């Protein structure tokens, strides 16, 4: 069906976009996985710095931690909606990686 074809192509697109953002994605796993979070709810943060930078050369391994406070906490809903939402997630990652190129495009446009 036409619908089914589009679904497959969306997933193909996610893959292609992930291939483009690959390097930046891994640079955001050795840094931003232990950086940006915004999921902690309730009141304030008890162990302030231990709850972020010390949590869970280009591709690092088991230097810091494993996955103690759920590495896949982020990957839960992320992979939960592998269709639609993830297409836009991949789009953002691409433009975050290639923001220099985005600027250039806008100025000539």
């Amino acid at each position: 069906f036409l619908w089914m074809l589009g679904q497959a192509l969306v997933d193909e697109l996610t893959r292609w976009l992930q291939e483009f953002t690959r390097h930046h994605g891994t640079m955001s796993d050795v840094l931003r996985a232990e950086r940006y979070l915004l999921t902690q709810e309730l009141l304030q943060g008890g162990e302030v710095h231990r709850g972020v930078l010390d949590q869970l050369a280009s591709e690092l391994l088991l230097d810091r931690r494993l996955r103690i406070p759920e590495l896949e906490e982020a990957e839960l809903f992320a992979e939960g909606q592998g269709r639609a939402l993830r297409l836009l997630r991949a789009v953002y990652q691409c433009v975050a990686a290639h923001s220099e190129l985005l600027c250039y495009f806008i100025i000539i446009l």
Binding site: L38, T39, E41, L42, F77, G80
Partner: protein, 369 residues
Amino acid sequence: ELVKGVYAKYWIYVCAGMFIVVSFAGRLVVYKIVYMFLFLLCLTLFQVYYSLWRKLLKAFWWLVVAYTMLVLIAVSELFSSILVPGFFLLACILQLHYFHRPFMQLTDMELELAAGFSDVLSRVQVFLRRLLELHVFKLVALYTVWVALKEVSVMNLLLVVLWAFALPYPRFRPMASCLSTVWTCVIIVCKMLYQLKVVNPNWFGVRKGFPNLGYIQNHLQVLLLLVFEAIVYRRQEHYRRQHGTRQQLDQDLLGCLKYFINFFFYKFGLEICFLMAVNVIGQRMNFLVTLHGCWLVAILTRRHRQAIARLWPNYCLFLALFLLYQYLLCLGSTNLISDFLLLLCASQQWQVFSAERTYLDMLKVAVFR
């Protein structure tokens, strides 16, 4: 047969319709009051007891006797009179004969899945109807429309001396409503005899009740609205007589929704009032709204919500007095409705400020980053 008891209870509204045909017929003055508006004042009687809702039977008993007397004395035209009020006296005398109780001495205070959802929804709405959401806001909205934006001058007693002081101080919010019923009943009584009898043109912004239908056509609408609110109130008053705060928040989307549906004005009310003042400013742009705007600056330069809370009784006072002045300026408008909205909102925030206060992570990502 549930309908047997339903129709034994159905006599008040049945009479109302017959008093509507008694209205605009027979005596333009007397008939209307005696039948329709004295039954509407008997409604007020049981409401003003605040304990005898639909239990007052003494006066409601003699309402029938008064109507029988009228028919016995008097009611094409001999025949008209007869037929017409017998038609309502028939129903009235029937209550006196039997089943006066279901409506007056019984309702007292002392299918499948889809249908299941339907009845739940009925009751949630009515819960909001028995909440301040309906008990007050909707009533005063229609009041302002049918007083300020409608017949001005002498309807100030039905608004700027009532709701302009009842909104800030909710102690007399229900008393105000009962008095309102009484006063508009009085207003229709007065306009019944129009004003064209030997006009020799004391001064209170005399607009004069020249039309018949159109002129009687709005005060009765708010009279009925009071009645409707009272009905839904006393319904759930006897449904209660007989018959998540920050925890649901972090659950999910349903939790967030629930929290705010129940606690919007609880927290947002202050920011609301600030924006309602801007609304008034924009839908006016006169010199009168410089006063509203000056007060806005004052309460916005108070920053900390605790300091705004001690400036709140004076803000609410200003708003109330301003509504009164605005009328006395229009008598002795849409701008009046805007100042009413601001008053209503800020009054509710005065009743919260020093009272009640004393996948969803992606959504939180948006607002909170």
